[PDB]
Design a binder for this molecule. Structure first.
Ligand code: SF4
Ligand code: SF4
Ligand code: SF4
Ligand code: SF4
Ligand code: SF4
Ligand code: SF4
Ligand code: FES
Ligand SMILES: [Ca+2]
Ligand SMILES: [Ca+2]
Ligand SMILES: [Ca+2]
Lengths: 154, 145, 754, 196, 377, 127
């Protein structure tokens, strides 16, 4: 029924999203805890020092590289759990089947809250010129995914 | 002649053709086997769908099933265990089904939602059309071979 | 030995043992914050509290197990509620003002505070548990403020163990750190800004928390995320034990590895911060010259082009020249290859005119139990860690008892702020050496002049009063040790006399070779023959190089294969076939220490590229000449060393050798032996590795050299720009050049271009 | 109750009894006496052979008698004629060089598959088993996986720019016999246990 | 005549004639290696590996391992935890029985009764997605209790499905008891001797289908099953007819349990607050250093339970299930062996269909209810 | 009270003075650390004027000569603090309704601050 969107529960385990505070700062402080807690060794994090002039996160430290191998990932949300800032939270998207193995490792700007759709969903709507129709809807956005705009009309 | 319009528009019609004569021939294994039965129930075969942990013992077996198939054929890989080494990174499992059969589409999840297996063949579909590319931006060959 | 009952276990243990080490030896445990392997115990933080009974009669107040000695028939309770409750509290106090950085803190899961916090903290009494009682404003101060380019200090974290400051006054002897105000307000600070001593890096490895941190590797990976690779630093002859942290093929950080036999748990800065270069710019594909320029080529292509330059070659004109840090295997192979391939000129980069195998190797153990130290050279540069053992030596310290847990936590032997004896050592060198401070008998000479001082010592001449007090010291010397380095080992005259002085008195010697694996390559026979052509002598016609030689030795030769690791300009202008080689970090094989000890080399998972070790390249260049080599890989090369009867790891290889090939000294400039190596000048090490140029202010300004000028200088070893420094300790009219290489201890012609 | 009679007996006969506070109790039998003594157990009313599980103590901190060791779990099902509920385990340390051990197929038919598994994963043979054939591991798997010196066989996980992760060198977790990332480990991370 | 017929289970059916000589099974095709890799994971991390063996009544696996570790390092599961943990356990047991009952509806043709059972199941799985955010393999059971509390919309929806099921389970018992074809199809075949079953270890609730009264939830009570309105279904003679009914009878009872536990569901804590076993309440991570330290440590290198060896039996829909864990005082277990009920159950199969017809050999294995991820693992 | 709110407001100010003096007399201002109760704040709310909690006016070598900090929102006995490192001088500034920012009875005005900063800079800076 890909003509009429699927209704997932608020708590569903979908493509990971990286959240921000209202300040515009990335919540994530490049600590690599999420990765350390992963049962499938599916996260790689390279940290880096903030620039006091042009910040990124609040700490002295932020995540330069944040990558998640969406094939290995088992979707436990152990990472969301271990995170001590609430930066990584499990999103809603699931329409993310793709073609070449390595195209399935999601990068930082593939996961920020201000992103719409998945790596392949977007890529199509790029060479298409037609916006992204997400095949899902929910009762409401979780509190924890604060900022994440999605089809919620219930 | 091969690159002319006459040949192209033919093969572009041919492809568009079996782009719909797609005959999903499931090959389920563990838990994934039970989430695919929730999509084939909602509604000679090409397109085998690997859904679950491919043991090393089970490997040379799925291999034969694939060989003895038509020639215009495709392989979707269902979820972590099929796609990647899954979360079982050990002696007992193959770390990518591409090690034994060529995969045309991978579908992340564990098990991937049923509705995602739908979207997954849609991708396979829209690729045998030769109407699909990767992130680098290259046109992708409709068949794995 | 003494009878001591820990909890339920009873243990024998020497008389002057720490109650702490008692406990750990029995196989128990206690919160440990301020005490440290090799540093004076003081009962500072008060974590290692225990209860003690001694007749059973229970002592009234808990004791600091780290500073209370064991007595016969002593019970030490480390489990009573009374005890846990106390540790629990002490931990609470330590955490009371701490800063809450963990996730962001570079101390990762390798932090003594965290671990003990979790280990003993939060007391179980016998409802909603309370994680924190203290609800007031924490102590806020300075943060992430770098003391030097290599150490970044975070005052807020510090817990006021005395480890760092204590270390400084004790091991190196360079007090450049110490608490400031008092009470809750005290903190770590300095007024000697650069962090002078060549041994600062160690405070990074001692600091229980994230206050003192390795800036060279700030914010790269968390401590578990790293791939540790235990191995040996081969920058100099002492072969300390290191661990190399690597992640995703790049080298992130270097640390000390405990190896008490040789270097203890210490590492000089050059060894620990000079890793900037290895994983950065590097030659990754063999090059061969096509049209008067070098171009990438497959090893297949190279091998053929190699065959070509050597088809027309008589097997005696072949030259083999290894690098100062050539493995024991690479040396043995190159030996036989020059044996079958009948040639006279095979040498190794750092080769001393006087073979270090001359003198009987002396253990670092021996050095502590010797009764005098006669030094002719600057240990602080030639073989750094020696300085630190001599620090233990000048304190009359002697190798601690080994316990069930190895090297002891609280050695009561070591008292804080000890007195240093200046009668236990004599120091002679071309400048005001650093260790001249703990040397009563001490004098400054001029370049290549040790020959006369060594003579005088023998008894065949009159030297200064100093040399005289030195003679009479060495005379009244019961079981002394001779430490000698560059000048001495590089001039046949002196070198010979040194050996004599050390034969007559039954004493051992420390060869401060400028070649890392000198004592090891000498044991394999990588020494030039009758003919001549040595590593700086342009003799041979077709030669293999494991390093960039003096420009003079290249110019002329018919065919040159340079097995470098980085592209030197001298190569891309004189080299015919350049092949990529691994650094000692990513090699495999054994080395021979300056004490004759043989130390292993493991391979770090760094980015080799398409390179291979000289073990292959040699064998490959052996085919294009004639005979098939005897060595393929390591597993098989091992057989040929175990053949020659060279001991396994850690063993010491005894091997003497009486033969010396002299050469004249063109005394204009003196390449002053330095800790840092030339090829290290990258990143943060960029400055600490720049060459220098010293001279006496008269002759300095008489040859027109301002006190802070950037000058260009030319030696037979190359043109280098160096800072210029005035020094009243520099003999009149000579110029001391930073001999950043292994060509140190040499007098050379040359001049200051303008 | 049929268990007290096992204990009152083992007590007299130099059979060491293990017991953890949680409700599980063992009884080590030496090599020889095992065979027969166990038959005697079933004869005593021990219906059902629940599990059997091989253990390899090679990487265990505190030393043990012999390297491998096998546990069995004999029981009297409470749904039958005169079943109490008397469950218990029995152990036998099997020499690193003599992987031999008498089957129990004789009295229990459950040991058929179960003994096969313990042969498959650890190197342990069983004297007189109908067919000692590999149960779980592919035919051509050389050796025995479940034992501590047999590589778990891991592949580095892959990421974009040649970023890899060899799990073995990445794990933050500590393997009991492992000293930890600091000099050592002590306190409530050498082992913890709350008090009811 | 040896015919090589081969869920993901291969059978060597030696067979000259139309009888059945000996059936020689060959498994190993879903050998994922759990027992080995769990020796290389946090005790927390292992909770994601446990539901991937019996992917149908997985929660029973979760609880079986949780209980073994809980006791080992001695933790106490709150009131509301234990309650949720059976509401969760049995709700999953219904899911594994709905499948078994559903595959027996097809082999009986009854096709609208099936189009219902597959909807029931999905309604249960909807519940698992409400609370645990997953269809299955739910990371919900924690060593102290449960990851987080249940949502507002769990109690309501569980009422909907806990209201239409009462008589509905009888409708399923109806069709199979008023056996048109069924009588002649199962009533005799698959002879399970009450005293040979207790020799091969056929403990899986298909034990009692053949006349034994050994249910572990009563015999050796665990998560408070000791305190419930509990009926253990019984079978007369060990055929397959009884085995299809017993398992339907079990649903009747598991539903009573859910209803009964749902009554004592008063608000409170969800995991043991003991800091050495449980991460610090999320919220104070902005104040307590001790909190930051514990949290940072807890999720990097997990906790260390004492040295020792424990085991505790539970009962999944497929019988006795237990984890035998060997702790060496590390962050990870030293050994984990799993008592796979479907593994020992499978030894009662050569005998099961001994000398029977061959077209009967499908519903003969399916009436033993093996799950391959269980046997193989 | 809601005087708490006004304290932080003033702390924002104290910082603005610091940044001013910094770029003014040609000497480095540095945010030393941000509130932990912000960094690790998650879905939880936050309505404080800044994230910056510890600040310094450091010299050429980086060694601070002035150190200011305010107490985190979740703490007790709140105060904004001044500290001249190395010279044992600690000032605790409170907040009184209508009077303003005070160190006891004496007001802490931009003037008085700038004075303190200088005394320190001139006598305590290493480079
Ligand atoms: S959901 Fe699980 S597998 Fe995926 S990144 Fe998070 S912890 Fe790793
Ligand atoms: S997402 Fe969270 S746990 Fe992961 S690195 Fe960022 S702050 Fe740390
Ligand atoms: S990918 Fe997940 S659901 Fe699918 S077989 Fe593997 S563990 Fe089971
Ligand atoms: S020194 Fe240790 S306890 Fe303190 S913040 Fe750093 S990692 Fe945490
Ligand atoms: S900086 Fe580190 S080593 Fe020095 S006193 Fe502070 S805690 Fe100890
Ligand atoms: S003293 Fe020598 S071996 Fe030791 S760390 Fe320094 S250069 Fe390396
Ligand atoms: S008191 Fe600090 S270790 Fe003994
Ligand atoms: Ca580097
Ligand atoms: Ca990189
Ligand atoms: Ca500063």
């Amino acid at each position: 029924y890909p003509d009429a969107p699927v209704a997932l529960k608020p708590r569903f385990h979908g493509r990971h999203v990286l959240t921000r505070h209202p300040n515009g700062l990335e919540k994530c402080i490049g600590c690599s805890l999420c990765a350390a807690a992963c049962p499938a060794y599916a996260i790689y994090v390279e940290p880096a020092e903030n620039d006091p002039e042009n910040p990124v996160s609040a700490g002295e430290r932020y995540a330069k590289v944040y990558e998640i191998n969406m094939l290995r990932c088992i979707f436990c949300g152990l990472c969301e759990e271990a995170c001590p800032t609430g930066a990584i939270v499990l999103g809603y998207d699931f329409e993310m089947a793709d073609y070449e193995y390595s195209d399935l490792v999601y990068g930082k700007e593939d996961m920020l809250v201000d992103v719409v759709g998945t790596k392949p969903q977007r890529r199509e709507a790029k060479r298409t010129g037609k916006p992204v129709k997400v095949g899902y809807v929910v009762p409401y956005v979780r509190p924890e995914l604060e900022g994440f705009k999605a089809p919620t009309e219930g | 002649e091969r690159e002319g319009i006459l040949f192209t528009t033919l093969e572009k019609l041919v492809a568009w053709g079996r782009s719909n004569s797609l005959w999903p021939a499931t090959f389920g294994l563990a838990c994934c086997a039970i989430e695919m039965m929730a999509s084939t129930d909602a509604r000679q075969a090409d397109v085998m769908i690997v859904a679950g942990r491919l043991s090393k013992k089970m490997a040379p077996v799925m291999r034969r099933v694939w060989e003895q198939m038509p020639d215009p054929k495709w392989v979707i890989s269902m979820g972590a265990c099929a796609s990647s080494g899954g979360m079982f990174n050990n002696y007992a499992i193959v770390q990518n089904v591409d090690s034994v059969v060529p995969v045309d589409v991978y579908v992340p999840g564990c098990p991937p939602r049923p509705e995602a297996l739908i979207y997954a063949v849609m991708q396979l579909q829209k690729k045998v059309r030769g109407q699909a590319y990767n992130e680098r931006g290259e046109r992708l060959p409709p068949v794995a071979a | 030995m003494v009878r001591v009952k820990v909890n339920d276990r009873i243990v024998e243990v020497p008389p002057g043992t720490s109650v702490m080490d008692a406990v750990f030896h029995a196989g128990y445990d206690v919160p440990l914050f301020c005490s440290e392997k090799h540093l004076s115990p003081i009962g500072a933080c008060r974590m290692c509290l225990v209860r003690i009974g001694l007749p059973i009669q229970w002592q009234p107040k808990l004791a600091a197990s780290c500073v209370t000695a064991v007595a016969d028939g002593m019970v030490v309770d480390t489990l009573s509620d009374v005890v846990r409750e106390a540790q629990a509290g002490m931990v609470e106090f330590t955490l009371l003002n701490h800063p809450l950085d963990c996730p962001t803190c570079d101390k990762g899961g390798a932090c003594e505070l965290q671990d003990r916090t979790v280990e003993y903290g939060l007391y179980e009494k016998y409802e909603l548990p309370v994680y924190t009682r203290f609800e007031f404003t924490r102590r806020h101060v300075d943060k992430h403020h770098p003391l030097s380019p290599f150490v970044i200090l975070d005052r807020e974290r510090c817990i006021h163990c005395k480890r760092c400051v204590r270390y400084f006054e004790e091991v190196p002897g360079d007090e450049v750190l110490d608490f400031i105000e008092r009470g809750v307000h005290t903190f770590i600070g300095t007024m000697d800004f650069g962090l002078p001593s060549g041994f600062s890096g160690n405070i990074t490895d001692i600091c229980p928390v994230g206050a003192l941190l390795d800036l060279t590797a700030r914010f790269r990976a968390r401590n578990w995320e790293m791939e540790e690779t235990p191995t040996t630093c081969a920058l100099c002859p002492v072969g300390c034990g290191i661990t190399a942290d690597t992640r995703s093929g790049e080298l992130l950080r270097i640390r000390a590895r405990e190896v008490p036999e040789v270097n203890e748990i210490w590492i000089c800065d050059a060894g620990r911060f000079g890793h900037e270069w290895a994983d950065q710019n590097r030659l990754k594909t063999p090059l061969v010259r096509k049209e008067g320029r070098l171009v990438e080529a497959t090893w297949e292509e190279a091998f053929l082009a190699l065959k070509e330059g050597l088809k027309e070659a008589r097997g005696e004109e072949v030259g083999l020249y290894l690098a100062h840090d050539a493995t024991l295997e690479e040396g043995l192979l190159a030996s036989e290859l020059a044996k079958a391939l009948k040639t006279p000129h095979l040498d190794f980069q750092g080769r001393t005119a006087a073979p270090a195998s001359l003198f009987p190797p002396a253990s670092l153990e021996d050095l502590l139990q010797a009764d005098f130290a006669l030094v002719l050279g600057d240990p602080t540069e030639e073989a750094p860690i020696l300085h630190l053992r001599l620090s233990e030596f000048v304190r009359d310290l002697k190798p601690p008892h080994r316990y069930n847990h190895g090297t002891p936590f609280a050695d009561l032997q070591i008292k804080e702020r000890m007195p240093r004896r200046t009668d236990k050592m004599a120091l002679f060198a071309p400048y005001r050496a650093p260790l001249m401070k703990w040397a009563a008998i001490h004098e400054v000479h001029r370049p290549g002049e040790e020959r006369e001082i060594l003579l005088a010592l023998l008894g065949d001449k009159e030297g200064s009063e100093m040399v005289a007090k030195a003679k009479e010291a060495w005379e009244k010397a019961k079981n002394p040790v001779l430490i000698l380095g560059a000048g001495v080992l590089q001039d046949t005259v002196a070198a010979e006399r040194a050996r004599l002085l050390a034969e007559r008195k039954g004493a051992k010697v420390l060869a401060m070779t400028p070649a890392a694996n000198a004592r090891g390559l000498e044991a394999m026979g990588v020494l030039p023959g009758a003919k001549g052509a040595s590593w700086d002598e342009p003799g041979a016609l077709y030669a293999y190089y494991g390093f960039v030689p003096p420009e003079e030795a290249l110019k002329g030769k018919r065919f040159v294969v340079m097995h470098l690791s980085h592209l030197h300009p001298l190569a891309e202008r004189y080299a015919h076939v350049v092949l990529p080689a691994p650094t000692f970090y990513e090699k495999r094989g054994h080395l021979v220490n300056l004490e004759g000890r043989v130390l292993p080399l493991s391979p770090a998972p760094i980015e080799n590229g398409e390179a291979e070790g000289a073990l292959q390249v040699l064998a490959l260049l052996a085919e294009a000449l004639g005979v098939r080599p005897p060595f393929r890989l390591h597993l098989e090369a091992q057989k040929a060393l175990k053949a020659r009867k060279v001991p396994e790891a850690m063993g010491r290889l005894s091997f003497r050798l009486k033969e010396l090939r002299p050469k004249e000294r063109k005394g204009a400039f003196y390449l002053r032996p330095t800790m840092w190596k030339a090829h290290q000048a990258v990143g943060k090490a960029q400055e600490a590795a720049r060459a220098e140029l010293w001279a006496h202010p008269e002759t300095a300004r008489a040859e027109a050299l301002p006190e802070g000028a950037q000058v260009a200088v030319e030696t037979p070893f190359g043109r280098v720009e160096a800072r210029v420094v005035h020094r009243e300790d520099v003999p009149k009219g000579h110029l001391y050049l930073s001999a950043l290489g292994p060509a140190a201890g040499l007098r050379v012609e040359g001049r200051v271009l303008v | 109750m049929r268990l007290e009679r096992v204990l009152e007996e083992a007590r007299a006969k130099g059979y060491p009894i293990e017991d953890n506070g949680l409700g599980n109790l063992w009884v080590v039998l030496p090599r020889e006496r095992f065979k027969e003594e166990m038959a005697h157990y079933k004869a005593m009313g021990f219906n059902f052979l629940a599990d059997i599980v091989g253990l390899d103590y090679l990487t265990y901190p505190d030393p043990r008698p012999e390297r491998f060791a096998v546990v069995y779990e004999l029981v009297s099902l409470p749904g039958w004629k005169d079943g109490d509920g008397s469950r218990f385990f029995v152990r036998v340390y099997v020499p690193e060089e003599d992987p031999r051990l008498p089957t129990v197929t004789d009295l229990w038919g459950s040991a058929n598959f179960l003994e096969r598994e313990v042969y498959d994963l650890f190197g342990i043979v069983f004297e007189g088993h109908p067919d000692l054939r590999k149960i779980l591991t592919p035919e051509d798997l050389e050796g025995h996986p479940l034992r501590k010196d047999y590589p778990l066989g891991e592949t580095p996980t892959l990421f974009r720019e040649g970023r890899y992760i060899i799990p073995a060198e990445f794990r933050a977790a500590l393997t009991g016999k492992d000293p930890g990332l600091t000099f050592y480990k002590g306190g409530s991370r050498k082992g913890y246990r709350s008090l009811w | 005549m040896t015919l090589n017929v081969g869920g993901v289970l291969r059978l060597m059916v030696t067979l000259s004639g139309e009888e059945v000589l000996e059936v020689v099974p060959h498994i190993g095709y879903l050998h994922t290696g759990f027992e080995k890799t769990m020796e290389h994971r946090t005790y927390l991390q292992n909770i994601t590996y446990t539901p991937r063996m019996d992917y149908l009544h997985s929660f029973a696996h979760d609880l079986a391992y949780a209980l073994a570790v809980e006791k080992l390092l001695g933790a106490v599961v709150p009131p509301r935890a234990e309650t949720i943990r059976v509401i969760l356990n049995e709700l999953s047991r219904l899911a594994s029985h709905l499948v078994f009952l559903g595959t027996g509806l097809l082999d009986l043709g009854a096709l609208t009764p099936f189009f219902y059972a597959f909807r029931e199941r999905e309604t249960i799985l909807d519940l698992f997605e409400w609370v645990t955010g997953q269809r299955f393999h739910h990371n919900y059971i924690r060593i102290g209790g449960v990851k987080e509390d249940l949502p507002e919309e769990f109690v309501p929806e569980l009422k909907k499905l806990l209201e239409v099921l009462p008589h509905r389970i009888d409708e399923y018992e109806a069709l199979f008891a008023e056996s048109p074809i069924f009588y002649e199809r199962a009533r005799g075949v698959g002879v399970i001797p009450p005293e040979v079953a207790i020799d091969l270890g056929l403990t899986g609730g298909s034990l009692r289908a053949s006349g034994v009264n050994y249910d572990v939830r009563k015999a050796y009570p665990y998560s408070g099953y000791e305190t419930y309105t509990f009926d253990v279904p019984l079978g007369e003679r060990g055929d397959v007819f009884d085995r299809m009914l017993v398992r339907i009878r079990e649903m009747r009872e598991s539903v009573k349990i859910i209803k009964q536990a749902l009554e004592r569901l008063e608000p409170g804590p969800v995991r043991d607050p003991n800091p050495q076993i449980t991460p610090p309440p999320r919220h104070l991570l902005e104040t307590s250093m001790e909190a930051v330290i514990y949290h940072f440590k807890h999720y990097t290198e997990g906790f260390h339970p004492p040295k020792g060896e424990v085991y505790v039996p539970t009962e999944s829909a497929r019988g006795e299930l237990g984890y035998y864990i060997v702790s060496d005082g590390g962050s990870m277990p030293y050994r984990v062996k799993v008592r796979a009920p479907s593994f020992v159950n499978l030894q009662s199969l050569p005998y099961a269909c001994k000398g029977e017809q061959v077209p009967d050999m499908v519903a003969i294995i399916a009436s033993l209810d093996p799950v391959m991820g269980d046997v193989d693992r | 009270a809601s005087s708490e709110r006004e304290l932080y407001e003033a702390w924002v100010e104290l910082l603005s003075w610091m940044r001013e003096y910094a770029q003014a007399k040609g000497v480095r201002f540095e945010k030393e650390a941000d509130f932990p109760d912000f960094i690790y704040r998650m879905e939880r709310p936050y309505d404080l004027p800044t994230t910056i909690m510890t600040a310094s006016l450091s010299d050429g070598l980086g060694e601070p000569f002035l150190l200011a900090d305010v107490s985190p929102r979740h703490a007790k006995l709140k105060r904004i603090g001044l500290r001249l490192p190395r010279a044992h001088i600690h000032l605790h500034a409170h907040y009184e309704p209508g009077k303003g920012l005070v160190t006891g009875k004496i007001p802490l005005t931009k003037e008085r601050f700038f004075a303190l900063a200088d005394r320190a800079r001139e006598a305590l800076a290493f480079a």
